[PDB]
DNA sequence: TAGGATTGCGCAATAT
DNA sequence: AATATTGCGCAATCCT
């Protein structure tokens, strides 16, 4: 009975739930995009640290090897 | 007119476009989530590398003493 | 069995 | 013209 009164309230409740679910998912996506930005900045920081330490170590090893 | 052949083909083509558009968005969102997993693992790897390089530096510097 | 959460899809207005 | 998006909503199904 798609004309019923009860039917309409059931549909209204689901429509409310749908918007809530969609909002939540779209927010989760936005949070995830933010996480990528955050993780990328951290990845760049770590890359820089690894390079710096690698050069420091290579220089020290060369010193010992030049004895 | 919903009986119009033009209408019928209009709906058929739009339904294809709507589905395509929605699949592309779901794909983009899944990739973004994937990148989080990727970067997380990579950052973990680099951190371990940082720690390893530091141990190697310490070991060598101990030779001075 | 009830009832909210998720998901896929259609429609039609609207944008490109 | 034709395809791409998107607000609104139906219905099935998943989850409590």
Kindly provide the resolution of this structure in angstroms, with one decimal: 1.8
The CATH number of residue B59's host domain is 1.20.5.170
Q: Are A39 and B36 in contact (CB under 8 A)?
A: yes
Quick check: helix, strand or coil at residue A13?
helix
Nearest Cα residue to A27 out of B29, B23, B31: B29
CA nearest to A51 within chain B: B50
Q: Are B56 and A60 in contact (CB under 8 A)?
A: no
* DSSP at A19: H
Sign for the pseudo-dihedral over CA of B8, B14, B15, B17 = positive
Domain that holds residue B5: 1-65
Calculated CA dihedral for residues A3, A9, A11, A12, nearest 10 degrees: 130
CA–CA distance, B5 with B14 (Å, rounded to integer): 14
The H or E element that residue B60 is part of is helix B5-61
CA–CA distance, A51 with B48 (Å, rounded to integer): 14
Q: Quickly list DSSP for B22-58.
A: HHHHHHHHHHHHHHHHHHHHHHHHHHHHHHHHHHHHH
CA–CA distance, B60 with A62 (Å, rounded to integer): 11
Q: Could you tell me which residues come within 8 angstroms of residue A59 by beta carbon, excluding any fewer than 6 positions away?
A: none
H-type alpha helices, A1-67? 5-65
Backbone angles phi, psi at B64, to 5 degrees: -70, -45
B52: tokens are 């390893």
Put simply, the answer to whether A43 touches B43 (Cβ < 8 Å) is yes
Does at least one atom of strand D sit less than 7 Å from the CB of B26? no
Q: Could you tell me which residues come within 8 angstroms of residue A50 by beta carbon, excluding any fewer than 6 positions away?
A: B46, B49, B50, B53
For chain A, how many structural domains are there in total? 1
Whether A60 has its CB under 8 Å from any CB of chain B: the answer is yes
């Amino acid at each position: 009975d798609k004309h019923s009164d009860e039917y309409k309230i059931r549909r209204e409740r689901n429509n409310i739930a749908v918007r809530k679910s969609r909002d939540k998912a779209k927010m989760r996506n936005l949070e995830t995009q933010h996480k990528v930005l955050e993780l990328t900045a951290e990845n760049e920081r770590l890359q820089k640290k690894v390079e710096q330490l690698s050069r420091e170590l290579s220089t020290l090893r060369n010193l010992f090897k030049q004895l």
